[PDB]
Amino acid sequence: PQITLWKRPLVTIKIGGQLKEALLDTGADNTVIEEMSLPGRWKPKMIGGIGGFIKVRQYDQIIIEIAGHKAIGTVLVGPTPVNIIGRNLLTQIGATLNF
Amino acid sequence: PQITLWKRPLVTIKIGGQLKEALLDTGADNTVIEEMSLPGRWKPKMIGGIGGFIKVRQYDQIIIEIAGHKAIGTVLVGPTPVNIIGRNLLTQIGATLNF
Numbered sequence: 001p002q003i004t005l006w007k008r009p010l011v012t013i014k015i016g017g018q019l020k021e022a023l024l025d026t027g028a029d030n031t032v033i034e035e036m037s038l039p040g041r042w043k044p045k046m047i048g049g050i051g052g053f054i055k056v057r058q059y060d061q062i063i064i065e066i067a068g069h070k071a072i073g074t075v076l077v078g079p080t081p082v083n084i085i086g087r088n089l090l091t092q093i094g095a096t097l098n099f
Numbered sequence: 100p101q102i103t104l105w106k107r108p109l110v111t112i113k114i115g116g117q118l119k120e121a122l123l124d125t126g127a128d129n130t131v132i133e134e135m136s137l138p139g140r141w142k143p144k145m146i147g148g149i150g151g152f153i154k155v156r157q158y159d160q161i162i163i164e165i166a167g168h169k170a171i172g173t174v175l176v177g178p179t180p181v182n183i184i185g186r187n188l189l190t191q192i193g194a195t196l197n198f
């Protein structure tokens with residue numbers, strides 16, 4: 001699609017067989033999702049947002065579908081106000097900014 | 100242009116007679132700029148993201164040139180770690196996300 005920005009660019013994602021709502025976020029290096037159960041081992045990561053730095057759990061090689069497009073990559077799990085799809089997965093689905 | 104997302108989508112903006120680097124951020128409702136002076140009236144506001152909330156000054160009807168395109172709208176000024184061009188101005192330059 002071509003998504004305009006008059007409203008939040010929310011899409012449906014599927015991760016662990018569950019549907020969730022998430023925000024397509026070019027200002028996010030990383031994909032970060034609210035607390036949920038994911039398989040495998042995780043690693044610690046610190047990410048800095050507008051209000052400061054937080055600790056999250058980094059899971060690699062996670063299968064995730066974004067607005068119908070299959071991706072497999074790193075997902076951070078932690079206290080984010082909304083699920084955000086960052087550039088690490090936007091690149092996998094071929095997303096660009098255009099004007 | 101067409102901006103790939105392998106790296107942060109940083110562009111040069113002109114605001115209040117100063118040049119700054121800023122992120123084209125589809126995840127941001129509003130444009131948020133690091134501390135600077137702007138003319139006219141303002142009111143305080145609180146905005147929240149990852150890491151919590153920060154207090155900002157809200158200036159309305161501010162002109163910004165974004166990668167050579169002029170837009171006008173509200174600008175929030177405060178202790179953001181990165182200058183963010185949010186949807187309120189991304190729409191004005193005709194920016195879309197495409198995949």
Ligand SMILES: [C][C]([C])[C]N([C][C]([O])[C]([C]C1=[C][C]=[C][C]=[C]1)[N]C(=O)O[C]1[C]O[C]2O[C][C][C]12)S(=O)(=O)C1=[C][C]=C([B]([O])=O)[C]=[C]1
Binds near residue numbers: 026048051084
């Ligand atoms: C979280 C989003 C729902 C809203 N944010 C916009 C995001 O794009 C934000 C932008 C950003 C980028 C760098 C540093 C700080 C912030 N990136 C972000 O946190 O990314 C994290 C995950 O990847 C990492 O890489 C970048 C930081 C880490 S926000 O800045 O908090 C915001 C909130 C309210 C309003 B308003 O007008 O009400 C406007 C903006």
Ligand SMILES: [Cl-]
Binds near residue numbers: 072073074088089
């Ligand atoms: Cl990844």
Ligand SMILES: [Cl-]
Binds near residue numbers: 171173187188
């Ligand atoms: Cl506006």
Ligand SMILES: [Cl-]
Binds near residue numbers: 004193
């Ligand atoms: Cl339009």
